[PDB]
C-alpha cells in the first residue's frame, strides 16, 4: 500500500549475473598479413610508397591476425566515395549500418537466448549499444522487431558511445536487473566499421591507425538477478560494482566526429601512456573496499584498443604474462570490435576455464576486473566475481 | 562480506524523487503568428503561394504562440545552404549543436543545482539526452566539464532519442537512484532545432509539420532516493513505476534519419489516432495494480507532440478540459521541445500548484501520470506521486 512497500516488492534481491553470452561476426574477413596490399589497392593508393611501408609496420605491430568486415572488395569497387580519404559518403554509410548493425546483433542475441534456454517473452529490457550509425527508431527497436520480443520491453538505445561502452552496458544492465524483480535484460553491442572505413592520407597517420585496428562484431548477454536454477538458469559471472571516470590531463586525447565524410577519429595525446599512468587509481577505488591489492590475483578483461595499451598496462602493474591471455586472444582473432570486444573476452575466458576444468569461470580465481577504455579519456571499471565450475 | 551483504549496503532504500527542476531556452524567439511569413521569406520561397497557405494553416492550428530558436535570421542569411530544402549541411549543423546543446543544458543544470542547494560534488551520475547532433566524447562529457563535476561521475549519454525520451530519462534515473545508496542523478534534456531546420518543398510536406512544431529548450533535474531533510532536500514528485511499449500497427509512423542534409523526419500514419486508441492499455497496466481506474483523478503530464494528440486523448478518455492545462501551457509558450517538454510541464505544474496554494505539487491530487510519445511508435508511461505543500 505504502510507497515503501511497493518499492521493496518491485526490486530484485541479489546481485546481477551474466546468464548467457553469444557472439557473431560478418562471415567475410581479411587476414592482417595481407591487409596493407589489399587496402592500398582498393583505395587506389599504390603510388604512396612510403605511406604503405608505414601502414605495413602498423599492421605487423598490431598483433591482429584476422578481422571480420561486412565491407567487401566488390562493394567498395562500386563505392569510391567510401574509398576516398575524405569524400561525402555518410548517406551510403548510414544506409549500410542502419540495417546491418541490428541484423548482426540479432545473430548474437539468438545464440545468447539459446544458451539461456528461457522463452524470449521473459526478456523485459533491451540495452543496445553501437558506435556505427544512428537512426530513429533505433537499432533497439529494430532488434525487438527482428527477435519478436514483447512490445512492452523496456529499451535503452546507446548510440555513438565508443570503445569504453562494453563497460557502460554492464553498468546499465546491472542497475536495471538489480532494481526490478524478475527483470531479464538482453544486452547487445554491435559494431560495423562501414562508417569509419576510408582511404589513407600521409598527413593523418592517426586515421591510419584505426584502419589497422578496427573490425566488426556483435556480442549479446542475458543479465539478471535472482537466477532460477529450477528452469536451468546459471550465472557465469556476477557483477559487484561498476564505475566510470575521466582521466586527468587527457582532454582531446581521442575525439571522434560524425560528419558528411562519415566518422573520423583524431588522436592528440599518448593514450597508452595515459591509461597505464592512471589505471591503478581505478583498481584501488574498486578493490580497496574488498581488501584486494594484488592485481595478479584477479582475472582480467581489458578492452584491446591496441597492443600498446595492453603492453604498457602489463608493465606498469607488473602483471604476469598470462593475465592478458584472453584479451590478447580476442585482439588477435578479431581485432578491436569497439564496445563488443570485452564481451568476446568474457566469453573466451569462461569457455577456456570450462574446457580446462579449472575451479571457476574466471580462470580458477574468485575476483576479476573488466575495463573499457575510450574517448574522454574515459575508463569504465567493473568488478566481477566468478562462479564455481 | 558476502555478495548479498555488499548488495544490500550498496543500494538505496526508498523511491526515487525529483528533488529540483530547472529550465532554459535560447533568448532568441519567434512568434508563431508571424512564422509563416518569416519562414517563407528567409528561405526565399515566397513564390510558393499555395504551400505557404498550407503552412499558415499548420501554424495557426498548432496552438503554439512562441518558440525559442538558437538559429537567427542573421545566421541564416550567412548560411543559405541551411535554408535550402535539401542542400549538404550536416557539417554546419553539427558545428552548431555539438557546442550549443551542452551549453544550453548547462544553463538549465545550474538552475536545478541552485534550487537543490547542495554541493555539485554530491552529484554521482549524469544522464544527458538530446536528439540534436552527436559527438565523441559526448555532450555528457562536455556538461561534466562545463559544470566542474567530479571526474568520476557515472555518465549515460542518450543520443538521437526523439520525443519520448523525457519519459526515458526518468526511467533511467529511477533505476540509477534507487539501486545506488546516496546516488544523486543530474538529468539533462537539451534540444536545438538547428539540425532539423530546412526550407519548404511540395515533395515533402511532413517535414513541414516539423517546421511548425519543433523548438529549442533544455531542462535539468536532480533525482535521488532517500532525501536528506537535514540539509534541505525535499522531493517535488516521487516516481513509482516506469514502463515503455510499442503501439500495435504503428510501424513506420514516425521515422527520423540523420543524413548529409541534416535530420529529416517522415510521417506515415495517424499518430494522434494511434496514441488515443491505445493509451488506455498503458493506463490500465500502470494503474490496475494501484486500484485506480478514474483517469480524471490523476494529475497529467503528456508530451505535447502537437495539439491533435492532446485533443484526441482528451476525447477518447473523457478527460475534463482542465487535465491538459499544464501541458497545453508549455506547448503554447514553448512549442514542442522534444524530450525536454515533459520536464517543463512538471516544472509548470509544481510552480502553479505552489502559487495557487493547493494541497500537493500535482494540482492537489495524489497520483499522476507522465507520458512520452515518439518514434516506434513508442509510449513511455511514468507513474508519479505528488508531495504535500
XYZ file of C-alpha atoms in Angstrom, chain A residues 27-348:
322
model
C 31.390 -14.086 -42.436
C 33.653 -12.011 -44.666
C 37.093 -11.431 -43.219
C 40.584 -10.219 -44.029
C 43.908 -11.618 -42.846
C 46.030 -8.833 -41.390
C 49.222 -10.058 -43.082
C 47.610 -9.301 -46.449
C 45.743 -6.166 -45.456
C 48.337 -3.499 -46.446
C 48.387 -4.735 -50.038
C 44.591 -5.018 -50.197
C 43.890 -1.658 -48.543
C 46.346 0.320 -50.664
C 44.974 -1.372 -53.797
C 41.256 -0.877 -53.137
C 41.830 2.752 -52.077
C 43.812 3.422 -55.307
C 46.850 4.454 -53.284
C 49.578 2.108 -54.559
C 51.765 5.045 -55.573
C 52.024 6.135 -51.902
C 55.145 4.045 -51.349
C 56.407 5.480 -48.074
C 52.938 5.617 -46.519
C 52.261 1.980 -47.433
C 55.509 0.993 -45.662
C 54.318 2.806 -42.523
C 50.977 1.014 -42.731
C 52.667 -2.363 -43.202
C 54.550 -1.732 -39.952
C 51.348 -0.650 -38.187
C 49.601 -3.833 -39.284
C 52.629 -6.001 -38.365
C 52.836 -4.443 -34.886
C 49.073 -4.694 -34.298
C 49.288 -8.382 -33.225
C 45.998 -8.879 -35.084
C 45.721 -11.968 -37.300
C 42.160 -11.719 -38.613
C 39.410 -9.098 -38.780
C 35.799 -9.625 -39.844
C 34.446 -6.940 -42.137
C 30.990 -6.521 -43.608
C 32.562 -4.374 -46.348
C 33.728 -6.404 -49.327
C 36.063 -5.590 -52.207
C 33.183 -5.907 -54.681
C 31.099 -3.418 -52.702
C 33.963 -0.926 -52.309
C 34.689 -1.017 -56.070
C 31.166 0.353 -56.551
C 31.571 2.987 -53.809
C 34.650 5.135 -54.439
C 33.330 7.879 -52.155
C 33.895 5.436 -49.251
C 37.358 4.552 -50.572
C 38.443 8.176 -50.619
C 40.182 9.643 -47.599
C 37.501 12.363 -47.307
C 34.589 12.381 -49.729
C 30.882 12.945 -48.970
C 29.684 9.493 -48.060
C 27.661 9.494 -44.831
C 24.357 8.646 -46.553
C 25.747 5.434 -48.070
C 27.480 4.532 -44.821
C 24.267 5.021 -42.854
C 22.276 3.005 -45.391
C 24.580 0.041 -44.657
C 24.823 0.222 -40.874
C 21.211 1.044 -40.007
C 20.359 -2.389 -41.482
C 23.465 -4.445 -40.750
C 24.069 -3.401 -37.139
C 20.753 -4.779 -35.760
C 20.974 -7.817 -38.077
C 24.378 -8.776 -36.683
C 23.150 -8.056 -33.155
C 20.244 -10.422 -33.735
C 22.629 -13.217 -34.718
C 24.476 -12.832 -31.403
C 21.229 -12.456 -29.436
C 19.746 -15.658 -30.847
C 22.811 -17.552 -29.615
C 22.636 -15.951 -26.178
C 18.933 -16.692 -25.846
C 19.511 -20.333 -26.867
C 22.167 -20.771 -24.163
C 19.929 -19.058 -21.586
C 17.252 -21.561 -22.517
C 14.250 -19.460 -21.464
C 11.445 -18.094 -23.663
C 12.171 -14.763 -25.307
C 8.905 -13.486 -23.810
C 10.761 -13.485 -20.463
C 13.050 -10.674 -21.692
C 11.898 -7.472 -20.003
C 14.629 -4.986 -21.001
C 16.827 -4.413 -24.074
C 20.078 -2.439 -23.998
C 21.544 -1.859 -27.468
C 24.967 -0.211 -27.918
C 26.693 0.776 -31.172
C 29.155 3.376 -32.438
C 28.171 2.544 -36.027
C 25.401 4.835 -37.322
C 22.296 6.410 -35.799
C 18.600 6.203 -36.748
C 15.093 6.758 -35.360
C 13.587 4.406 -34.273
C 16.880 2.960 -33.120
C 18.633 -0.354 -33.514
C 16.977 -1.309 -30.215
C 13.566 -1.093 -31.866
C 14.834 -2.969 -34.915
C 16.260 -5.774 -32.754
C 12.989 -6.043 -30.815
C 11.140 -6.466 -34.117
C 13.683 -8.893 -35.606
C 13.505 -11.134 -32.499
C 9.765 -10.826 -31.890
C 10.161 -9.673 -28.305
C 7.184 -8.408 -26.342
C 6.181 -4.874 -27.394
C 6.492 -3.772 -23.754
C 10.229 -4.467 -23.414
C 11.940 -1.502 -21.732
C 14.597 -0.350 -24.210
C 17.711 1.793 -23.906
C 19.486 2.856 -27.100
C 23.163 3.797 -26.601
C 24.489 5.479 -29.731
C 27.875 6.850 -30.661
C 29.434 5.734 -27.401
C 32.878 4.467 -28.372
C 35.261 1.903 -27.140
C 34.538 2.103 -23.382
C 30.886 1.198 -23.761
C 31.251 -2.550 -23.199
C 31.733 -1.499 -19.599
C 28.889 1.007 -19.820
C 26.311 -1.545 -20.906
C 27.281 -3.796 -17.997
C 26.892 -0.821 -15.634
C 23.452 -0.102 -17.147
C 22.283 -3.718 -17.136
C 23.386 -4.100 -13.506
C 21.082 -1.353 -12.279
C 18.197 -2.492 -14.496
C 18.458 -6.101 -13.325
C 19.005 -5.308 -9.644
C 16.257 -2.722 -9.312
C 13.480 -4.758 -10.968
C 12.304 -8.111 -9.644
C 12.189 -10.667 -12.440
C 13.946 -8.419 -14.929
C 15.914 -10.194 -17.654
C 17.997 -7.772 -19.700
C 19.111 -8.528 -23.245
C 22.329 -6.544 -23.800
C 23.647 -6.249 -27.362
C 26.799 -4.489 -28.579
C 27.121 -4.457 -32.385
C 29.829 -2.709 -34.405
C 30.258 -2.455 -38.188
C 33.170 -0.362 -39.489
C 31.417 0.907 -42.628
C 31.102 4.348 -41.043
C 34.852 4.677 -40.306
C 36.467 2.905 -43.284
C 38.335 5.394 -45.500
C 41.446 5.755 -47.645
C 44.825 6.899 -46.499
C 46.392 10.318 -46.069
C 50.075 10.867 -45.330
C 49.225 13.886 -43.136
C 46.757 11.926 -40.934
C 48.554 8.894 -39.523
C 46.206 8.624 -36.542
C 43.429 7.932 -39.037
C 45.606 5.160 -40.494
C 45.964 3.567 -37.063
C 42.225 2.998 -36.954
C 42.325 1.396 -40.389
C 44.773 -1.151 -38.973
C 42.807 -1.928 -35.788
C 39.021 -1.583 -36.103
C 36.851 -4.552 -37.003
C 33.291 -5.875 -36.959
C 31.439 -7.985 -34.436
C 28.491 -8.242 -32.065
C 28.036 -9.776 -28.644
C 24.865 -10.375 -26.654
C 24.233 -11.077 -22.997
C 21.352 -12.037 -20.785
C 21.716 -10.257 -17.424
C 19.515 -10.858 -14.392
C 19.342 -11.054 -10.630
C 17.911 -13.949 -8.631
C 18.603 -16.762 -11.132
C 16.138 -19.637 -11.136
C 18.084 -22.897 -11.117
C 14.884 -24.941 -11.435
C 14.358 -23.738 -15.012
C 18.027 -24.009 -15.964
C 19.380 -20.500 -15.369
C 23.000 -20.418 -14.271
C 25.199 -17.321 -13.812
C 28.598 -17.216 -15.442
C 29.856 -14.062 -13.741
C 28.315 -11.866 -11.052
C 28.629 -8.096 -11.117
C 29.701 -6.469 -7.844
C 30.360 -2.831 -8.727
C 30.654 -0.603 -11.792
C 32.445 2.749 -12.027
C 33.362 5.345 -14.644
C 35.974 8.096 -14.616
C 37.630 10.702 -16.846
C 41.423 10.543 -16.740
C 43.224 13.740 -15.701
C 45.129 15.735 -18.286
C 43.510 13.771 -21.111
C 41.367 16.392 -22.836
C 41.192 15.797 -26.563
C 43.253 12.626 -26.384
C 40.769 10.821 -28.676
C 37.984 12.710 -30.486
C 35.505 11.249 -32.951
C 33.264 13.341 -35.202
C 30.288 12.282 -37.326
C 30.478 14.368 -40.476
C 29.449 14.290 -44.138
C 32.513 12.094 -44.803
C 31.445 9.619 -42.099
C 33.035 9.014 -38.724
C 36.568 10.356 -38.280
C 38.951 9.871 -35.356
C 41.720 12.158 -34.121
C 44.470 11.444 -31.581
C 46.278 14.257 -29.755
C 47.920 12.538 -26.772
C 49.712 9.299 -25.814
C 46.729 7.131 -24.966
C 48.635 4.003 -23.805
C 50.664 6.309 -21.563
C 47.599 7.988 -20.078
C 45.834 4.690 -19.398
C 48.835 2.978 -17.779
C 49.693 6.094 -15.714
C 46.220 6.168 -14.150
C 44.761 2.663 -14.153
C 45.998 1.907 -10.631
C 43.749 4.660 -9.259
C 40.732 2.816 -10.715
C 41.937 -0.512 -9.315
C 42.350 0.992 -5.837
C 38.919 2.606 -5.892
C 37.291 -0.676 -6.947
C 39.197 -3.127 -4.756
C 40.296 -1.304 -1.604
C 36.753 -1.776 -0.188
C 37.217 -5.509 -0.835
C 40.658 -5.832 0.754
C 42.420 -6.668 -2.527
C 45.756 -5.127 -3.551
C 47.464 -7.924 -5.588
C 46.412 -7.321 -9.179
C 47.786 -10.712 -10.259
C 45.185 -12.392 -8.007
C 42.421 -11.113 -10.298
C 41.146 -12.471 -13.559
C 41.465 -9.712 -16.163
C 39.398 -8.370 -19.045
C 40.718 -5.239 -20.741
C 39.405 -3.505 -23.814
C 42.022 -4.344 -26.506
C 42.149 -0.864 -28.019
C 45.560 -1.753 -29.394
C 48.589 -3.773 -28.328
C 50.460 -0.808 -26.817
C 47.715 -0.208 -24.240
C 47.908 -3.830 -23.078
C 51.707 -3.904 -23.099
C 52.077 -0.736 -21.061
C 49.384 -1.686 -18.526
C 51.076 -5.074 -18.035
C 54.480 -3.451 -17.468
C 53.219 -0.682 -15.193
C 51.331 -3.080 -12.934
C 53.744 -5.995 -13.055
C 51.097 -8.355 -14.398
C 52.162 -11.909 -15.162
C 52.207 -12.530 -18.907
C 49.232 -14.878 -18.509
C 46.840 -12.226 -17.180
C 46.189 -10.695 -20.621
C 45.891 -14.054 -22.450
C 42.121 -13.953 -23.063
C 42.254 -10.285 -24.045
C 45.114 -10.832 -26.499
C 43.425 -13.884 -27.998
C 40.384 -11.774 -28.942
C 42.561 -8.976 -30.272
C 44.478 -11.496 -32.390
C 41.491 -13.383 -33.809
C 39.001 -10.494 -34.147
C 40.713 -7.112 -33.830
C 39.290 -4.084 -31.996
C 35.488 -4.513 -32.242
C 34.886 -1.409 -30.099
C 32.224 -1.964 -27.402
C 31.716 -5.641 -28.196
C 35.345 -6.631 -27.597
C 35.281 -7.075 -23.810
C 32.149 -9.256 -24.111
C 34.006 -11.539 -26.551
C 36.786 -11.705 -23.947
C 34.365 -12.723 -21.183
C 33.114 -15.492 -23.477
C 36.653 -16.657 -24.284
